Write a protein that binds this DNA or RNA. Structure first.
Ligand SMILES: [Mg+2]
Ligand SMILES: [Mg+2]
Length: 254
DNA sequence: GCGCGCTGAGGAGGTTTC
DNA sequence: TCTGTAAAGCGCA
DNA sequence: GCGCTTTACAGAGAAA
DNA sequence: CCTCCTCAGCGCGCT
């Protein structure tokens, strides 16, 4: 990878991965994993390549196929993973998972009984300005998008053929995170908090759309998975929708 | 040559955030 | 994540 | 006062 | 995203 394609990785992991210290009979299993739709087998192997470690597995949970990259080897974790996340730390209230994980690990905790009682605080760690001002952000956001962003098109009413074309992204307990992104890309839609503590950001404007495209075209790194394809197909329909077409530039990649 | 302490690949059950 | 629905804003004819 | 455009709000599940 | 369990199996210190 690049100095920065790793920042891309914590991005992806923050949004779709997970740190976990689980019960393994008498002992513990330390791991980092991402489980994605089989639609990203190809991406899973690009991650293994970048990181250089990790076990890949497949399963059906019967009609949905899925791929997973899983790193449980503690030496490899200490030797390759911590370092990444130390250098390019996550931003959301998730770092609590990594800090907790890290500590238990470095402490040499190997039994369930000496493993601290842990529960993620919903309490944020940063606030807009700090996220937005960290160097690697631009890259991180690319992966975070790879992971949780959504490109889509839908008619506004059943009957008539008036398309909308939106880009959205949400996160539980992440008002500060979601808002910060919102600021960064200059959206002005109102971030919506749902039934859960899930902050949803969504845009439809000709100017908003114009903006992700530009952020992406000028982001340090690149989307390389299914989301990349989702975006390219989006791009495409964006040409058959006039209001957008006579209003922005677009396709070669990302 | 074996029993012990501990480990991770392999395999899979159970919730819920996107 | 992905796709809406019901309901506005904004000219302008 | 009607065409075109954005927006607040939010419900299923597949993909986490 | 999150969690648990089985089982070769590896290095040790003994019988
Ligand atoms: Mg996530
Ligand atoms: Mg994803």
């Amino acid at each position: 990878g690049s100095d920065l394609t790793y920042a891309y990785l914590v991005g992806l992991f923050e949004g779709d991965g997970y740190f976990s210290i689980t019960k393994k009979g008498k002992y513990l299993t330390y791991e980092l994993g991402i489980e994605l739709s089989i639609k990203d087998v190809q991406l899973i192997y690009k991650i293994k390549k970048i990181l250089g470690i990790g076990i890949v597995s497949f399963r059906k949970r019967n009609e949905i196929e899925m791929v997973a990259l899983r790193i449980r080897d503690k030496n490899h974790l200490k030797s390759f993973i911590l370092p990444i996340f130390e250098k390019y730390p996550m931003f959301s209230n998730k770092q609590y998972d990594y800090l907790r994980f890290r500590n238990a690990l470095l402490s040499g905790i190997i039994s369930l009984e000496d493993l601290p009682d842990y529960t993620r605080s919903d309490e944020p760690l940063n606030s807009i300005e700090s996220i937005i001002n960290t160097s690697y952000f631009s890259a991180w956001l690319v992966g975070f998008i790879e992971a949780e962003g959504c490109f889509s098109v839908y008619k506004l009413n059943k009957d008539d053929d008036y398309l909308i074309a939106s880009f959205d992204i949400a996160q539980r307990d992440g008002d500060i995170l979601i808002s910060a992104i919102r600021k960064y890309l200059s959206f002005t839609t109102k971030v919506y908090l749902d039934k859960t503590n899930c902050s949803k950001l969504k845009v439809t404007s000709v100017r908003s759309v114009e903006n992700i495209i530009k952020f992406l075209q000028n982001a340090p790194v690149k989307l390389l998975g299914n989301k990349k394809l989702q975006y390219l197909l989006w791009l495409k329909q964006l040409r058959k929708i006039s209001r957008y077409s006579e209003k922005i530039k677009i396709p070669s990649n990302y």
